Amino acid sequence: STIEEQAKTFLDKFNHEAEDLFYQSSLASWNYNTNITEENVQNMNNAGDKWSAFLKEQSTLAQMYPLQEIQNLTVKLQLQALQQNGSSVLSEDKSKRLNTILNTMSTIYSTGKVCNPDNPQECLLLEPGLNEIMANSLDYNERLWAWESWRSEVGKQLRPLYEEYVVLKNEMARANHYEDYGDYWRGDYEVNGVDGYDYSRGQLIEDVEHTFEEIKPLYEHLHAYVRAKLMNAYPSYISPIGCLPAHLLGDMWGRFWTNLYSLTVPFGQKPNIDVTDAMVDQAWDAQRIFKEAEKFFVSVGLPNMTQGFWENSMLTDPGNVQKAVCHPTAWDLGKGDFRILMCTKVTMDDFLTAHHEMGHIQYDMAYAAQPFLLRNGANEGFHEAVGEIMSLSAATPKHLKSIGLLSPDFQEDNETEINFLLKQALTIVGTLPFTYMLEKWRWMVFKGEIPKDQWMKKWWEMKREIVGVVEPVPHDETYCDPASLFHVSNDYSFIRYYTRTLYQFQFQEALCQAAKHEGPLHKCDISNSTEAGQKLFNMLRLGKSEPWTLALENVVGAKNMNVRPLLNYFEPLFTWLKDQNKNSFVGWSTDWSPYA
Amino acid sequence: PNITNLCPFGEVFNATRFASVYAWNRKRISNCVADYSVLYNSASFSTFKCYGVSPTKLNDLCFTNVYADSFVIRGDEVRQIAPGQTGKIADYNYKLPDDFTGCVIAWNSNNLDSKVGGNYNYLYRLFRKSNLKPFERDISTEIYQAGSTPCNGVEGFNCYFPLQSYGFQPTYGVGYQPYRVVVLSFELLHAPATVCGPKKS
Ligand SMILES: *[C@@H]1O[C@H](CO)[C@@H](O)[C@H](O)[C@H]1NC(C)=O
Ligand SMILES: *[C@@H]1O[C@H](CO)[C@@H](O)[C@H](O)[C@H]1NC(C)=O
Ligand SMILES: *[C@@H]1O[C@H](CO)[C@@H](O)[C@H](O)[C@H]1NC(C)=O
Ligand SMILES: *[C@@H]1O[C@H](CO)[C@@H](O)[C@H](O)[C@H]1NC(C)=O
Ligand SMILES: *[C@@H]1O[C@H](CO)[C@@H](O)[C@H](O)[C@H]1NC(C)=O
């Protein structure tokens, strides 16, 4: 008789058929990834095309039910994801051209080689290649050569493709009643229809700036300390006042500064935490790693893994001919099928990655009772932050001494905490200006504030202003330097990594106050405390059924993203860096003083 | 006397293929002796609730009519098969009365009913105009008219086929794996009762 009952019946039908077809698609993708075979590629293509055609047909049927006669907010949340036309609002020619453009972005980015000009005799791809020379080599000239070669090649390949991509995406977003495609990316954080908890998608570009203006002194001190320390390896190439050259940061894009820790460790004579030789002397195994992770999870009060998880996951390289994608991915196939695809070695980093992926798995099992549309994170940052909680908790000396891995008489003095917090800073606060700059550049490009002839000038200007990195040689619009990154070339939103890095410290402070930890936040372990686990599970269980502001307020008491836990986490490191930079040039002006 | 001519519970429980829940089989059991203690001693049954009896009262009380109803459901709605529950199977597929006097027997059948490509043969009724009466059966495939528009037998935006298939693949989690469920109904009428427990000689 009414609209809402018809909508609820349609949603039930869509939930059942979508669970079936999504399980088929996810099983096909799993069989492709754990078993590289062209038949599996064809099967995964067929399953993905069937799911895409089904989603397009049910999106066509969803427009017949108007939203403004529906009073139930859960029905609105389930129906808004169906009523989005997506790329289908374009013509068939434009949609086919956009799909072909995205595919050739993927194939160009995947197939890059590092062959020397006038020496084409032998070279590798990026992953056995550029990662090794950019991460481990201390030489200036070969790093500059690799940087210039890769960026020049992928810039000349990807420059007009990205221009057609931004034009087509702007047309698709303007047809879909959004202002721009960057505004379409901000639609994930938009909350409407809940009074008090409303969050406009234009408020996100205010909140990100408001958090970054309080990040900025800490990043200035970190950059000053790094620039002072980098003089020891590059005496003449860098200046004490100006910004850093781009190819010295230990990563191909400057996204993570983790590889610069070995060059910039404060106290090398102190025995740092390794727990890898002690792991291999105790003769651990991947099964032992994941069993200790599951023992850590049930200490907090989370439910343990199913037997199907243990019998179906691929935790070890399967064999000779069965090649697989070794990237760490947690898989939620639906219908109670949870499994982890991540190849393991006896490594502390693999232990932390196992904690990360098992946290993603626990987050996926938490919203299993939700209907199919609401089986997702509250925003795109929550699902990545929940694993980072487990990564921060497992890295503590208290958790390592609890499991008998670390030596019991290991002393946690000042230096052994400062050098660990510096590594955590190079992992975490180092990615913040690069992430905020990249998303601001993409938002200005998608908005149309930057013309074609000013892309690279504005990009390098904002890099010098925000990140404090100068280009090694001058570049022009014939290249497209930011498109060399995976996420921008493969149409991924990148603001998830900023929000992940603030929500992880908000959640960590909330759980450590819940776990009654009287010490500092970096030494806090949220293990063995059921009262923290219930508070965590109360927001894990919601899924997309609640606004992300309300789910955030359920655990931290604040309905907006906040930056103070990140600052008070790094507070001893901040005080040590402020006492370290008494005479060095803290901060920077925009300049070309190292290289013109 | 000697005990021979037992009830064929092995015919019901150990059947090769069970029925789907929208068309559940009902078998009348009469004029035989039944060993419920043998059923209880079998550890394979993952769920054994009795709502008006104990196995001791199963052995010590004679009954007139025993109806074995058998179907396949998922693990999550095993708790739905109970007196007074509300849920999709309990509303549209198989309704138990509030004053039920019987036993509900359920065990996992993932190693028989599941197959790798999906056993879509096990159906269930998703939409119906009204809830069922207790022990009602409806094998009708009438197109569900959710809106004011007539269906005229064809598929449409508001006219849905009422039956949906379970997937039942062996990689499913617990709660989505198939569970063979046998429900026994015990009642007394104005008739000579004949079914009763075995006698210790
Ligand atoms: C992996 O792929 C090969 C390619 O034919 C196939 O023979 C093999 O059975 C696959 N592995 C598994 C576990 O199915
Ligand atoms: C929305 O619908 C669901 C399913 O019928 C119901 O459980 C929930 O209470 C409804 N919400 C409101 C606010 O009426
Ligand atoms: C999970 O934990 C429960 C209760 O501690 C236990 O009964 C069950 O066997 C555990 N399952 C696994 C796979 O460890
Ligand atoms: C957590 O509790 C267990 C059980 O007593 C204990 O073995 C372990 O040492 C505890 N962990 C910490 C960090 O106290
Ligand atoms: C079913 O099969 C099992 C195993 O063969 C057997 O022990 C049992 O007696 C059979 N009948 C019943 C009613 O369980």
Q: In 3-state terms, what secondary structure has residue A258?
A: helix
CA of B72 to the centre of ligand 2 (A): 29
Residue A286's SS3 state is helix
> In this structure, is residue A337 part of a structural domain?
yes
Say yes or no for a CB contact (<8 Å) between B160 and A9.
Answer: yes
Contact assignment for B171 to A337 by CB distance below 8 Å: yes
Pairing of strands B144-145, B159-160: antiparallel
Query: Does one domain contain both B95 and B161?
Result: no
Q: What whole-number distance in Å separates Cα of residue B86 and Cα of residue B114?
A: 27
**For residue A59, what is the nearest residue in chain B, using CA coordinates?**
B157
What is the distance, to the nearest Å, from the Cα of residue A382 to the centroid of all Cα atoms in its chain? 10
Place of tokens 């009724």: B125
Please tell me whether A479 is known to bind a ligand: no
One domain for residues B79 and B51: yes
Contacts 24+ apart (CB under 8 A), A56-61: A56/A88, A58/A14, A58/A17, A58/A18, A58/A82, A59/A83, A59/A84, A59/A85, A59/A86, A59/A88, A61/A10, A61/B157
User: Same domain, yes or no, for A402 and A441?
Assistant: no
State which residue of chain A sits closest to B128, comparing Cα positions: A9
- Radius of gyration of chain A, Cα coordinates, nearest whole angstrom: 25
Q: Which helix H or strand E contains A246, and what residues bound it? A: none
CATH number of the domain to which A184 belongs? 1.10.1370.10
- Establish if A528 belongs to a structural domain: no
Cβ-contact A524, A392 below 8 angstroms: no
Q: Is B172 on the interface with A (CB under 8 A)?
A: yes
d(CA A538, CA A558): 15
Domain count, chain B: 2
Q: Residue with the nearest Cα to atom 11 of ligand 1? A: A35
For residues A233 and A286, membership in a common domain is answered with no
The closest-lying atom of ligand 1 relative to the alpha carbon of residue A31 is 14
Question: Is A178 among the annotated ligand-binding positions?
Answer: no
Spell out which residues of chain A touch residue B169, defining contact as CB-CB under 8 Å: 23, 27
The single-letter DSSP state of residue A314 is B
- Looking at the fold, whether B70 and B42 belong to one and the same domain comes out as yes
Minimal Cα–Cα distance from A38 to chain B, Å?
A: 19
DSSP 8-state secondary structure symbol assigned to residue A500:
H
Question: B71, exposed or middle or buried, with CB in 10 Å at 0-12, 13-18, 19+?
Answer: buried
8 A C-beta contact, residue B70 and residue B181: yes
Q: Which helix (H) or strand (E) holds A297?
A: helix A286-300
Q: CB–CB of A151/A157 below 8 Å?
A: no
Q: Which of A415, A487, A553, A571 is catalytic?
A: A487
Residues 6+ away with beta carbon under 8 Å from A514: A526, A529, A531, A532, A535
Last residue of a domain, one of A366, A392, A409: A409
Q: Which of A190, A292, A294, A357 is catalytic?
A: A357
Q: At what angle do helices A73-83 and A3-33 cross, to 10 degrees?
A: 60
Do B122 and B141 lie in one domain? The reply is yes
- What are all long-range contacts of A185-191, with beta carbons under 8 Å and residues at least 24 apart? A185/A493, A185/A495, A186/A495, A188/A379, A188/A380, A188/A493, A189/A379, A189/A499, A189/A548, A191/A547, A191/A548, A191/A549
Classify the C-alpha dihedral A456-A457-A460-A466 as positive or negative.
negative
Print the domain residue range for A45.
3-84
Spatial separation of the C-alpha atoms in residues A556 and A513, rounded to whole Å? 10
3 state SS of B169: coil
Alpha carbon distance A83, A73 (integer Å): 15
Tell whether B6 and B86 lie within a shared domain: yes
**Considering A409, A434, A458, which residue would you say is the last residue of a domain?**
A409
- Say if residue B10 is in the same domain as residue B79: yes
Chain A residues within 8 A of B77 when measuring between CB atoms = none
Chain A residues near residue B171 by CB distance under 8 angstroms: 27, 308, 312, 333, 337
Give residue A528 CA to ligand 4 midpoint distance, Å: 7
Q: Which of A20, A65, A372 to mutate to test the interface with B (most CBs of B within 10 A)?
A: A20
Our answer to whether residue A517 is catalytic in this structure is: no
- Of A402, A399, A393, A406, nearest to A279 (Cα)? A406
Give the list of residues 6+ apart from residue B84 with CB closer than 8 angstroms, or none.
B96, B98
Q: Which of A44, A322, A325, A341 to mutate to test the pocket of ligand 1 (most atoms within 8 A of CB)?
A: A322
CA distance A369 to A542: 9
Task: Answer yes or no: do A358 and A293 share one domain.
Answer: yes
- Do both A99 and A200 map to the same domain? yes
**Residues A486, A594: one domain?**
yes
| Domain-located, residue A536 | no
Quote the CA–CA distance of B70 and B57 in Å, as a whole number: 23
**B102-108 and B47-50 strand pairing:** antiparallel
Contact A308 B147 (CB under 8 A): no
State how far the Cα of B100 lies from the Cα of A28, in Å rounded to an integer: 45
Name the nearest CA neighbour of A45 among A28, A22, A61. A28
Examine the fold and report which residue of A36, A65, A84 is the final residue of a domain before the chain moves on: A84
Measured distance CA(A416)–CA(A423) in Å, rounded: 11
In a domain, A541, yes or no: no
**Residues A135, A199 within the same domain:** yes
Q: Resolution of the coordinates in A?
A: 3.3
Instruction: For residue B25, give both structure tokens.
Output: 């089989």
> In 3D, which of B70, B152, B189, B146 has the Cα closest to residue A9?
B146
Residue A241 structure tokens:
């006042």
**Element containing residue B28 per DSSP (H, E):** strand B25-29
Chain B partners within 8 Å of A10 (Cβ): 146, 157-158
- Residue A584: in which H helix or E strand, if any? none
Residue type, A22: F
Which burial class, exposed, middle or buried, applies to A301 when counting CB atoms under 10 A from its CB (0-12, 13-18, 19+)? Answer: middle
Cβ-proximal residues to A324 (8 Å cutoff; 6+ apart), any chain? A33, A34, A35, A36, A314, A317, A318, A341, A343
Confirm or reject: Cβ of A74 under 6 Å from ligand 2.
yes
3-state secondary structure (DSSP) of residue A4: helix
Which residue in chain A is spatially nearest to B176 when comparing CA positions? A335
Q: Do residues A425 and A462 both lie within one domain?
A: yes
Q: What was the experiment behind these coordinates?
A: cryo-EM
User: Nearest-5° angle of CA B171, CA B175, CA B181?
Assistant: 110
Choose among A306, A433, A324, A330: nearest CA to A391. A330
Confirm or reject contact between B145 and chain A (CB < 8 A): no
Question: Cα–Cα distance between B26 and A317 in angstroms, integer?
Answer: 51
Q: What values do phi and psi take at A2, rounded to 5?
A: -110, 170
Count of CA atoms in the C-beta half-sphere (13 A) of A139: 10
Domain region containing B61: 1-117+170-201
Q: How far does the CA of residue A168 sit from the closest CA of chain B (Å)?
A: 32
Q: How far, in whole angstroms, is CA A191 from its chain's centroid?
A: 22
CB within 8 Å: A337 and B167: no
CA nearest to A106, candidates A157, A38, A173: A157
Task: State both tokens at A475.
Answer: 């570049």
Claim to verify: residue B108 and residue B122 sit in the same structural domain: no
Domain assignment present for residue A221? The answer is: yes
Residues A140 and A223 in one domain: yes
In a domain, A304, yes or no: yes
What span, in angstroms and rounded, lies between the C-alpha atoms of A75 and A11? Answer: 8
- Point out which residues pair with A282 in neighbouring strands: none
Distance between Cα A8 and ligand 2 center (Å): 10
**B176:A64 CB<8 A:** no
Nearest to A306 among B146, B147, B173 (CB): B173
Q: Does residue A431 lie within any of the structural domains?
A: yes
Angle CA A399–A361–A400, to nearest 5: 10
Same domain as B162, residue B111 = no
- Whether residues A20 and B158 touch (CB distance < 8 A) is answered with no
Integer Cα distance of A450 and A463 in angstroms: 15
Task: Kindly give the number of the ligand 2 atom that is closest to the alpha carbon of A74.
Answer: 1
**Is A142 annotated in some ligand binding site?**
no
* A395 and A430 assigned to the same domain: no
Q: Are residues A23 and B157, on separate chains, in Cβ contact within 8 Å?
A: no
If asked whether residues A41 and A156 sit together in one domain, one would say no
Residues of B in contact with A17 (CB under 8 A): 164
Can you tell me the distance from the alpha carbon of A521 to that of A568, in angstroms, rounded to the nearest whole number? 8
Strands (E), A172-283: 244-245
Looking at the structure, tell me whether residues B12 and B72 fall in a common domain.
yes
Place of tokens 């300049």: A591
In one letter, which amino acid is A476? D
Cβ A338–B173 below 8 Å, yes or no?
Answer: yes
b (16+ CB within 10 A) / e for A47-59: beeebeebbeebb
Residue B115, C-beta contacts closer than 8 angstroms, at least 6 positions apart: B168, B169, B170
Could you write out the DSSP letters of every residue in A505-551?
Answer: HHHHHHHHHHTT--S-STT---TT-HHHHHHHHHHHTTGGGS-HHHH
Closest residue in A to B158 (Cα–Cα) = A6
Give yes or no: residues A25 and A148 share one domain.
Answer: no
Same domain for B135 and B38?
A: no
Consecutive H or E run containing B69: strand B65-74
User: Ligand 4 — pocket residues by CB below 6 A?
Assistant: A 299, 398, 402, 525, 527-528
Residues B88, B72: Cα–Cα separation, whole Å: 14
Determine whether the shortest distance from the Cβ of A111 to ligand 3 is under 6 A. no
What is the distance of C-alpha A99 from the center of its chain? 24
List CB contacts (< 8 A) between A47 and chain B: none
Residues A24/A47, Cβ–Cβ less than 8 Å: yes
- Single-letter residue type at A418: I
Neighbours of A502 (CB within 10 A): 22
User: Is residue A542 included in any domain, yes or no?
Assistant: no
Verify that B133 and B182 share a domain, yes or no: no
Q: Are residues A510 and A558 in the same domain?
A: yes
Q: Is A487 annotated as catalytic?
A: yes
Total number of domains in chain A: 3
Q: Do B104 and B81 share a structural domain?
A: yes
In terms of C-beta density within 10 A (0-12 exposed, 13-18 middle, 19 or more buried), how is residue A543 classed? buried
Of B148, B160, B165, the CB nearest to A13: B160
Under 8 Å CB-to-CB from A347, ≥6 apart: which residues? A276, A279
End-to-end CA distance of chain B: 8
